[PDB]
From a paper:
The functional assembly involves three chaperones together with the oligomeric caseinolytic protease catalytic subunit P (ClpP). This protease represents a potential target for therapeutic intervention in pathogenic bacteria.
One crystal form reveals a compressed state of the ClpP tetradecamer and two forms an open state.
Numbering used by the authors:
A (entry chain P): 6 to 10, 21 to 196
B (entry chain M): 5 to 15, 17 to 197
C (entry chain N), G (entry chain U), J (entry chain K): 6 to 198
D (entry chain H): 6 to 13, 17 to 198
E (entry chain I): 6 to 10, 19 to 197
F (entry chain O): 5 to 12, 18 to 198
H (entry chain T): 5 to 14, 17 to 197
I (entry chain J): 5 to 11, 21 to 201
The structure:
């Protein structure tokens, strides 16, 4: 449990450090959003350092974080410190141009969305078409931030695609692999 | 209480349960949910009865809320395949696959008792996984929906689009309404 | 020879049990909940007894709290459809669909033993989903309620309005009250009388 | 596993159907729709076999469902044969009612049996209007059952009411004195 | 599962030789099956002995006392033979066999105790049930005293807690008449 | 990963710190707990200043109608304009709250999912009681449809048609529909 | 200084939360089920506010499906007992005991926001045991039903027979219908108007 | 919703509402009587006596009862301490709850008008050997007798009247409870 | 898969050759079935050997000692053969077969140990149950000593913990008399 | 008069099923897990078939993932003890104790169908308790591991050192690989062969 120094996360927050750690859900996404807005209110020009260690989770929650990162005035530098899978890798890749990093041993994984629905065929169809629109949007977001063609992203996310940091840098998901300060 | 037995005296004795005894009278029941077990038992009985006599009618008594479409469509196809006319009689509920099986009985030989509930609908399903697989299964269930609607259209004489409109939500019908719609041929109250 | 037992342990057991013995005398039981299994078994017995002799009474002994209306109305319809008169006899409880089946026995041949409980009520149902589907299921159950009230009115001789009033809440009757109401024709205490 | 008896061609009987040939019927364990109906079926069967020969109804029951049990009671009174009753362990609640409802002079207990009488148990949850309907009903049931006990025992209704307010356990000899049975029997030769 | 051996299951074949088993818990089902077998054997021949093999930890007192009473009621002598355990109501049934005809195999475990029970509810009802179980305790002690020949006070002292006896100890105490090691 | 603290001398949870900027979140399901907390924040902010705008951020799949309609009514009742901003999902009761924001001050970030549909309910009992509850949910459905019509500018008929089954919209489509006024991508706009 | 939070995670937490802030403005919430916990908390707040000032109104905001009658009638009684007028405002749902508490606010000071659901009904109960005890509990619940009807009659100005008729089954009302019925005094849409 | 806080200016200090009402010598029993709830009441009673041994305490009761041993500790503490403990029923006082209500200081036992008061005999339960069953049955009869004696003493009723009237659950309205002696006053309005 | 038939189930057919199986745990059901079979076979022919095939991890001591006593009591010699496992009461029953007529197949696992028990309650009752299991332990050790020809002291030492033996080791110890691999081989 | 069924419901059901009819052709199945029940039934069948004819081959069809070693080794030993050759035939899977039994069939009469999966490995076990007892059970399973490897070495003709190496982890083989390894003698695809 969290030592005092402030709790340590609150102390690091005052140096513009924000963590996403574990699953992306409504609670974790919203906490990140709250910290980003707070940091922008404190100083709208200073960079923010967003440390990501996440297997992903809820797309709608995560796209809230993604959007807030683009919306606020501060550049949001992203740093992968373990795993950045699924929505986690989207958040990593959506950091500020030239300010997307990973530590050398991190796993970065990209895939297509997961979902499901039970009900009448009419409703299955509505939800199927929705997740296909989401799939298309997430692919377009990755294409944008990575510099890959959409067709490359579509092919490369059809199944789970695990990359090491150096592969992820080459692919355009990050800008730098950093080993020491 | 479980199924009773009848003893038939032989030149000793044989025992038959009541359903086995009524099978001798070419009576077959679908009772309760349609699943692989229940559908296959009906199919086996239908095939047996055709083997015993290919030309005599079979009397298929239906009380079902439906269930698995693939299991049920085996029954439907078997009913059409075999040479005997399969008369259908709704004796309580014919819902979903139940009503499809009722409507699929031999021309002019689809019956309901007067208080039966008939219900027609669109198929239910579900799948969890990747967007690609969700699309595969969604496409499949839409094809199944279309096929089931075409079957209903064929046997009722309704336009396909009328069946589509009328099955978009659960549609409950009384026996007389089911007759008027073409899901059955006769509402019967007394043997006479 | 086929072995004799008190009760079969499974439907396909090759043994002649007490219920099979009494089926030979044209006695059929509904015992416990009305559901697809119990209702269909009664229907099979009624069709069989009809095929054995279309012109001999059937004695339908009822002890049931009711249960599924669709299953139960299949039994009610079969009772009216077949050629034999189906005499009904309440031997403990006839509630809800149980009382409907009791009251649907052949004219003048509806009986209760003296201590039986008879209860009439309006149907119970339930549905969860979209408002559109709630409305569909509501309209259906109201139609069913109306149909059942008309069945009871027919067999009892009561006006429809009286049936509606008296089934709004659970209505418990002793056997003599059930006779007076028209749900049965006779209360019987001894075979000799 | 129920043992088999073969009788001379030849027919196998379960032990209970073998005893059924001697017009012996058991109620064993809880009174419910299953057990009550099985008893009723056997009584109807034995009447059909012979309407004048006595039936011997052995009871070992803690009671159970009143409606199911009252079907057995009414069937006992209805059929032409006298239904002798014999308590072989416990007759409690509906069990003791069925025991006491046996034919006049032919209600027995073995010497170590426990016989218990009490008032009806019920339960209901719902609207106050419905609670009242069900309460009124169970009071009517309580009254009926007390009148049945009064009838078969010879006790005044007021005594039955007093004595069944709470569980009332009696030894076989005490049940005989009370009028719930006619005889305690310890050996066949006596 | 039960082998077949006229074709019977093995218990039915042994029943034909007047052999009856109580195996496992005494409850309404198991007690009643024994009763049915005893009444059947009496009907078949009222004079011939019955051999009642017991291996049971006991169980329901009321179910057990029906068996005990039936044993005393029927005309046949009911020899009892412990072939494993005879504890609680099991030992009462062993001890209640015909005078001189209560046996045990040499390694059997015999155990006697006071009744177990319990009840929850209003104090008035607790008292009613407590009073009842005390009468049951008294009756069962009198049954054991009668069949063993011990004084009532001795039975009371010796059943206050679980009292385990070996077959020779059970014989000396009067719970059985003979310990039998071989037929020959 | 729990709630960070900000010190201004007094400690604030991050959410109370943002409450000083008149920012309020609805996050996750609408239920009595979450709704009541929003209502309390709105009443508080009104008491702090009845004229200053309130910024109500919504990321919700909806939930209990009665709970949610309390939030809706409070939004309309208090003097401050309640600006609404969709930051992920606004589905069902969530989209109603979004669409109920002050005229001209209803926003979404570009990637949000907005979904509208008809009410869900459920009842078990006597036919008489089934009918009572059915009549009630139909009145609720009608009232919710008239609320959407009012705030969107769509005719009632269009709202009824478009909410019969789940209807998902991207932020720009929700804007064109009248559920929001602006899609915002960058603070400099 | 005492830290500020949106909501306390525990009762004894040393922080000043949104509810604490509004309690300073004499605002009290009943939110969710009426049970011993929620009821007692409202009572404590009412007693505290009376002790702070016996001559200033309290604003009691209600969003509740009801629940335990004994707990809720403590709140009702406390509202009547204390010197301050307790204004009631429905802010989502006021059903069963919730609607009684709403209707029990100070004369002329009972409000609803426009979209609130108000529902009145008869009490719900349950008991299992001996017939004697069933009768005791039935008699009690009927007395409770009668008292609650008399309370509703008193605050609404409806006659007792009207209340009895109208609460026999669940009776759902919109805010305007509740005002017409006398369960509230005003439907309020905007603070300005 | 959880207990709110009040800030008192000094810096600042925080109290929850129950802690704030404890300053006004108000103590609550709310919900089931168990070791936790009973002991917390006892601790508040002892604390209030320490703060002022002569000023009344106001003990608000809304309880279905519960554990007799835990509750009889509260009962004894109420009699033992120097301050009068006024009791006020604010919803339900059943079983041990009614005993605690009835055991308030003479003349200072109150109910609000709609409260439900219920008196009964004790509930218990035990499983084991007949010997131990007897031991526990004897104990609960003695507890039954002692609780009836407590009620007789505080109500003024004859013991046998209490015995008769608690054999089954006995529900009383506040006015009936006053007539019976379980409380002294039904109060509708502070004024 | 379930017991097949011949125009008898397979076990009934083998019972005609006086073959009785103990297979799986020793409990009241399995023990009593063995006893019923032994009594039956004795009554059919009291002079012919009975062959008792054992594959059992043991189980309840009272149930199993009924089988032990019945094996000694009846007139037929009860030959035993281990056809998989004979552990705990399984090994005791194997060892208790007729002198010279106890066998094992070659790969069988024999295991001997002391009794397992358990009790919760008052100290007085714990003492009673403890005293009883100690007497049972003694009796079972004396039974093994008798059939193996080992001294009691050796049995105690070797059963203090689970003691696993291969068939040849069990034979050397006296728990069986012969290890048999082929029906055609001379019995050694 | 003994009725015919595809499969028996119970052990002592009086019906002549598909397996009984095949047992008349000296066909015996091990299907599914090796445990006391499945092993003992195979043993019973092997002894029966030996009594019916001591010379004729037995056809032991194996589709098994393995299971309990003690139970399985009783089947193995019985196969070696009885007079008639037990030919083994893999019809799906022969894994762990399944493959040992496959490989333990009579010389030259061990078969597989072409698509079967054969898997060999070392023993799985487990024990919890005192360190002394852990050592006892560890020593025992190591002895079992040794004997089982020696059994595979004997029937395959592989050296012990090869079997130890190749069973250290799960080793899956197709039918042709298993023949080449010596676990079977022939892979059979057609009746005409």
């Amino acid at each position: 449990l969290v030592p005092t120094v402030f709790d340590i996360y609150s102390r690091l927050l005052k140096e513009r450090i924000v963590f996403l750690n574990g699953e992306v859900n409504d609670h974790s996404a919203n906490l990140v959003i709250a910290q980003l807005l707070f940091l922008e209110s404190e100083d709208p020009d200073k960079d923010i350092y967003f440390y990501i260690n996440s297997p992903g989770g809820m797309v709608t929650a995560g796209m809230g974080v993604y959007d807030t990162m683009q919306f606020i005035k501060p550049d949001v530098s992203t740093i992968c410190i373990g795993l950045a899978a699924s929505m986690g890798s989207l958040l990593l890749a959506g950091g500020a141009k030239g300010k997307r990093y990973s530590l050398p041993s991190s796993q970065i994984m990209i895939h297509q969305p997961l979902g499901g629905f039970r009900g009448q065929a009419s409703d299955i169809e509505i939800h199927a078409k929705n997740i296909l629109r989401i799939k298309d949007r997430l692919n377009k977001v990755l294409a944008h931030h990575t510099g890959q063609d959409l067709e490359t992203i579509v092919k490369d996310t059809d199944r789970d695609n695990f990359m090491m940091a150096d592969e992820a840098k080459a692919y355009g998901l990050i800008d730098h692999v950093i080993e020491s300060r």
